[PDB]
Design a protein around this nucleic acid. Structure first.
Ligand SMILES: [Mg+2]
Ligand SMILES: [Mg+2]
Ligand SMILES: [Mg+2]
Ligand SMILES: [Mg+2]
Ligand SMILES: [Mg+2]
Ligand SMILES: [Mg+2]
Ligand SMILES: [Mg+2]
Ligand SMILES: [Mg+2]
Ligand SMILES: [Mg+2]
Ligand SMILES: [Mg+2]
Ligand SMILES: [Mg+2]
Ligand SMILES: [Mg+2]
Ligand SMILES: [Mg+2]
Ligand SMILES: [Mg+2]
Ligand SMILES: [Mg+2]
Ligand SMILES: [Mg+2]
Ligand SMILES: [Mg+2]
Ligand SMILES: [Mg+2]
Ligand SMILES: [Mg+2]
Ligand SMILES: [Mg+2]
Ligand SMILES: [Mg+2]
Ligand SMILES: [Mg+2]
Ligand SMILES: [Mg+2]
Ligand SMILES: [Mg+2]
Ligand SMILES: [Mg+2]
Ligand SMILES: [Mg+2]
Ligand SMILES: [Mg+2]
Ligand SMILES: [Mg+2]
Ligand SMILES: [Mg+2]
Ligand SMILES: [Mg+2]
Ligand SMILES: [Mg+2]
Ligand SMILES: [Mg+2]
Ligand SMILES: [Mg+2]
Ligand SMILES: [Mg+2]
Ligand SMILES: [Mg+2]
Ligand SMILES: [Mg+2]
Ligand SMILES: [Mg+2]
Ligand SMILES: [Mg+2]
Ligand SMILES: [Mg+2]
Ligand SMILES: [Mg+2]
Ligand SMILES: [Mg+2]
Ligand SMILES: [Mg+2]
Ligand SMILES: [Mg+2]
Ligand SMILES: [Mg+2]
Ligand SMILES: [Mg+2]
Ligand SMILES: [Mg+2]
Ligand SMILES: [Mg+2]
Ligand SMILES: [Mg+2]
Ligand SMILES: [Mg+2]
Ligand SMILES: [Mg+2]
Ligand SMILES: [Mg+2]
Lengths: 100, 146, 63, 102
RNA sequence: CGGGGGGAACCUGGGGAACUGAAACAUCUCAGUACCCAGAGGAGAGGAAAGAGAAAUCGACUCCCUGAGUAGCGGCGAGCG
RNA sequence: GCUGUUGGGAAGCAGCGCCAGAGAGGGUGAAAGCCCCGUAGGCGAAAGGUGGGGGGAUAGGUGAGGGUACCCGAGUACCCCGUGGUUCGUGGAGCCAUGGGGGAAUCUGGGCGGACCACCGCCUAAGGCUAAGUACUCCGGGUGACCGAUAGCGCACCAGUACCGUGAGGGAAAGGUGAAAAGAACCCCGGGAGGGGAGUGAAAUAGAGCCUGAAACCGUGGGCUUACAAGCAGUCACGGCCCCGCAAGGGGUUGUGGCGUGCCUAUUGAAGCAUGAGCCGGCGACUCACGGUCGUGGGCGAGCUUAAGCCGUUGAGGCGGAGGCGUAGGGAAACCGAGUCCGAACAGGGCGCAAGCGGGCCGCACGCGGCCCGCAAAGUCCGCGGCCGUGGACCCGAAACCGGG
RNA sequence: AGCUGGGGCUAGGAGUGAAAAGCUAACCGAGCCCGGAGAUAGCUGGUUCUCCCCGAAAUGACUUUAGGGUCAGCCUCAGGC
RNA sequence: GGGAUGACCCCAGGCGGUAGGGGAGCGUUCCCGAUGCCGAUGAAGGCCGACCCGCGAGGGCGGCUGGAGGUAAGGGAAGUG
RNA sequence: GACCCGGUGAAAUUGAACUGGCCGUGAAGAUGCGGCCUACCCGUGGCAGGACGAAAAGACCCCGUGGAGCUUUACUGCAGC
């Protein structure tokens, strides 16, 4: 609603910057930030050494959100924008000389 | 032509007059320098002194007007011969408005200086000198009122 | 907005074609008796100078 | 407003950058087409062109071209004429152009 | 069967000042403005002539432009119009 | 619309392509028509509001001559007294409304056309209803030669809040790390707050009321210089010292000598012991509209010009001659007119008028016919500027006055 | 003619007042708030960048005028002789 | 005066100056120019300069900072110093 | 209390200051001008002669055709009678 977009829980390419050319699976959509996740971009989160679940250690991070505009879908080829087909009754998205 | 230099020629001068700076119109402000320079005077035109201005002259130009208003009466508008010369045929009002003088001013009265010409002229009044010159070849449509 | 013409002027002055202010001579509305014929007689019309520009400004539109 | 309107066209004319036409071979308002016709007519896109025609189809044709200023004949102003290196006019536009002069 | 109460401005009606201007002031102006009160509405008012005004004329009312700062009103002052 | 390259990050730059009824704009690590949201264009409501705009259907309504002469809005018309409105202020004061007194008639009636009469003419009061065009903007949306956190609404932020006041009421300040918290785990000093290493980052004097970070103000270090001088603090000239430079030559400091009455305002007159200012930064004062009068750049010229509005576009302009100013001036006016007014006066006298052109240039009139010429004779319209009039009219400031609370 | 708690009434040309023009929410010869309102102020203060040319007055008449004004005189700018 | 008008050379004068009149400019915000041009090899802004150009208001050039905007030549508006 | 030490730490005012005396000068009462005479630099406790010391745009005086409270056989109105 007003904030829907291009991709979801599928395979994508990253034409971004530092991690250009990278390709990854389900990007856990936000979308209240227009970011995703993929398996790219990692950093080093300090993480204080508290017992809860990090009993003495601290310096492990997860996957950076990554602004959704920097990713592009890929199917039976490389990138390419996206088109929409009727499905003769329901509704589905197809590429441009490809599918879904 | 082109975007550059289409600019106003010679005298455009927008440069108004700002009075604020050591050079030009400082302090006082390009005039003033005393007091009674703040929001205005009283005119002068007619006003001030504390005297009689110049309302001592009497208005013998009587007949100011009664309350009901001015009296509706037919007003006449002149037009010398010099003008008319311009065109031939039969000159008439309406025909004169849809051209030069008159224009609704009501009631045409041809007259004065200029040479007459062989052409009928429909009017409402005629000066002596008009009837004269025109007798020497030319119209005379007078009377009207119908 | 839109100047108004001064009715006290129009009612007592008239502007000629050359642009000259003209008005009635003053001094004969109730002095008469021990005034010579020459006085009362010499009451026609007259000009005005320097004052007709300040004067003319009030008969703006009537021209 | 008359003279001005006239003197504009004049200048452009004298420079040799005026060009009234009729041969709008680029039919159905498609940018593609109009671009081809311009190529064969000498309008590469290196000079601003004030295209004034009463054909709504040729209107849509250009418009989107950064070097073309589309306009109908009744709306022919002098400002636009002076801000465009070249003047291409429809013949039907050159009609009302006359009529709008003394 | 209705009403009561509210709503930024805008509308109508009933009431309705003074500073100020007149280089003092009382007629006059500011002004039937500000403000109070009542009522009506997405609008209100007005509206089929006991009209206008001089044209053998026009043809309900309302709103814009001219008429026009004209005609006129005025301690014929300031000014109102 | 991919690849390449510089880069922390391409959308930049390079090569080679493509769309366009879409090249408005916004966002993505920087500046992108082709990555994202969109734009041109084209679709779409079961339900609820709106809606004669297009359809029908009801309610209601339509005639002619001749008679009678019954009806045609009552404490009303009309008259007087006291007032209000209109431009109308007692004025020659009508017309519309009405507080008091008196007080008719029904078309042979009755009001009006500016006191009142007489002709001529206009219209039917004392019952009521009636859309559209007009006004406004809490709300929605679109635009901006509108502001950009002292501006713009009082408020960009948890504001009509904190706070003041009994109360009515008054009423603020205060926005920003970064592309992304990756916002600093752990170690050292320390009770902590704070630092120092290390680490994230392109950048950390971008480290968290953190972008840039000026000035006043307070420090630490270095150079020059002061304890026999004295002065609106500077300035000119030599000298010494220290820096820069190859050197002529500059920069900084000031020992001695000369010369020297701050700034502003107000004033006849100030360094003044007359006003005002602690210092720094920012807000702060000749504007706008409508008329007028001069000058000016232009358009057209015996003419010039449009207002409201209609049609267009969606930063496009046309149309619209109702009207305005000028071509004639005098006279209070009737009126006449290049004249008019005072006057018996073709005496006088006051106001007014008496404008072309050098002439572009030849017809192959050895003319000026006419056209051309420039304001012109002569004026209008628009722009611009000076000043004036009316509005707060250059800005701040009263003691007071009135209305409602 | 006592002091005092609580509860009540009277107010802006109005109250109340063993009377001073006292008090009326720390200032009363007419309270306070908001509005008219940006009242008016012939008075005081202030009025911002640079350079070039010219360059005054502090007089006269009239003024409920006298520290303010209108006209003339004196400065400047453009056109003409 | 040379004419050659080329604003470029000569000759001779004038150039203290408050209120005021006049004439030239500088800089600030915004608009057309702009679907442009300048910019990460660093825009605006800030801190220095003994350098350059203007009589001057200013404008350039260079070094550090700064981190995303700025806008010529010619013209148009004004909350402009 | 003042005075010294330890702790916390205001204010009005303030053109800037490198702030001596006498004769004299000057808008006629000089740290600041002139001549001369004194005078090493910086402080603490104290006195108040001066800085026409601070504070409050003199409340006495005058001016303004400013305001307000009051009076009466000033003018003109109004309630009431
Ligand atoms: Mg797309
Ligand atoms: Mg200015
Ligand atoms: Mg100024
Ligand atoms: Mg001067
Ligand atoms: Mg002053
Ligand atoms: Mg004086
Ligand atoms: Mg005044
Ligand atoms: Mg285009
Ligand atoms: Mg009064
Ligand atoms: Mg009064
Ligand atoms: Mg008065
Ligand atoms: Mg209605
Ligand atoms: Mg009135
Ligand atoms: Mg790339
Ligand atoms: Mg590209
Ligand atoms: Mg009967
Ligand atoms: Mg009836
Ligand atoms: Mg009655
Ligand atoms: Mg009657
Ligand atoms: Mg009638
Ligand atoms: Mg604010
Ligand atoms: Mg409280
Ligand atoms: Mg930084
Ligand atoms: Mg930033
Ligand atoms: Mg030191
Ligand atoms: Mg020594
Ligand atoms: Mg000295
Ligand atoms: Mg004095
Ligand atoms: Mg003086
Ligand atoms: Mg002083
Ligand atoms: Mg002193
Ligand atoms: Mg003083
Ligand atoms: Mg002081
Ligand atoms: Mg005031
Ligand atoms: Mg009680
Ligand atoms: Mg009290
Ligand atoms: Mg109180
Ligand atoms: Mg008022
Ligand atoms: Mg001189
Ligand atoms: Mg004197
Ligand atoms: Mg000089
Ligand atoms: Mg701005
Ligand atoms: Mg800027
Ligand atoms: Mg300003
Ligand atoms: Mg102590
Ligand atoms: Mg000393
Ligand atoms: Mg002395
Ligand atoms: Mg001395
Ligand atoms: Mg001591
Ligand atoms: Mg003591
Ligand atoms: Mg005083």
């Amino acid at each position: 609603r007003v904030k829907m977009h291009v991709k979801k829980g599928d395979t994508v390419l990253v034409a971004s910057g530092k991690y250009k050319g990278r390709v990854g699976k389900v990007k856990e959509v936000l979308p209240k930030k227009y970011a995703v996740i993929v398996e790219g971009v990692n950093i080093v989160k300090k993480a204080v050494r508290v017992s809860p679940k990090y009993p003495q250690g601290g310096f492990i991070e997860k996957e950076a959100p990554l602004h959704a505009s920097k990713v592009r879908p890929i199917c039976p080829a490389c990138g390419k924008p996206t088109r929409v087909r009727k499905k003769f009754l329901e509704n589905g998205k197809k590429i441009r000389v490809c599918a879904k | 032509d082109l975007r550059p230099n289409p600019g106003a020629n010679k005298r455009r001068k927008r440069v108004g007059r700002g009075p604020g700076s050591g050079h030009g119109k400082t302090a006082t402000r390009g005039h003033k320098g005393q007091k009674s320079r703040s929001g205005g005077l009283k005119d002068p035109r007619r006003f001030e002194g504390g005297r009689s201005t110049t309302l001592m002259r009497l208005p013998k130009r009587g007949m100011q007007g009664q309350v009901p208003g001015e009296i509706k009466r037919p007003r006449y508008q002149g037009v010398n011969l010099k003008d008319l010369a311009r065109f031939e045929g039969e000159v008439t009002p309406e025909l004169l408005v849809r051209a030069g003088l008159l224009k609704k001013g009501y009631r045409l009265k041809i007259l004065g200086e200029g040479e007459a010409k062989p052409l009928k002229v429909v009017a409402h009044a005629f000066s002596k000198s008009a009837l004269e010159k025109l007798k020497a070849a030319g119209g005379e449509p007078v009377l009207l009122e119908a | 907005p839109k100047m108004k013409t001064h009715k006290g002027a129009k009612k007592r002055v008239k502007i000629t074609a050359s642009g000259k202010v003209v008005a009635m001579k003053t001094g004969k509305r109730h002095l008469n008796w021990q005034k010579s014929g020459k006085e009362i007689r010499q009451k026609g019309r007259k000009f005005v100078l320097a004052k007709p520009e300040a004067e003319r400004i009030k008969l703006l539109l009537p021209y | 407003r008359k003279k001005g309107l006239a003197m504009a066209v004049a200048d452009r004319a004298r420079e040799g950058k005026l060009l009234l036409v009729e041969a709008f071979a680029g039919v159905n308002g498609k940018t593609k087409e109009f671009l081809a016709w311009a190529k064969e007519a000498g309008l590469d896109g290196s000079e601003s062109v004030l295209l004034v025609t009463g054909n709504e189809l040729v209107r849509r044709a250009a418009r989107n071209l950064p070097w073309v200023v589309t306009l109908a004949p009744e709306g022919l102003n002098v400002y636009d004429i002076v801000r465009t290196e070249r003047l291409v006019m429809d013949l039907d536009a050159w009609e009302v152009f006359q009529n709008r002069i003394g």
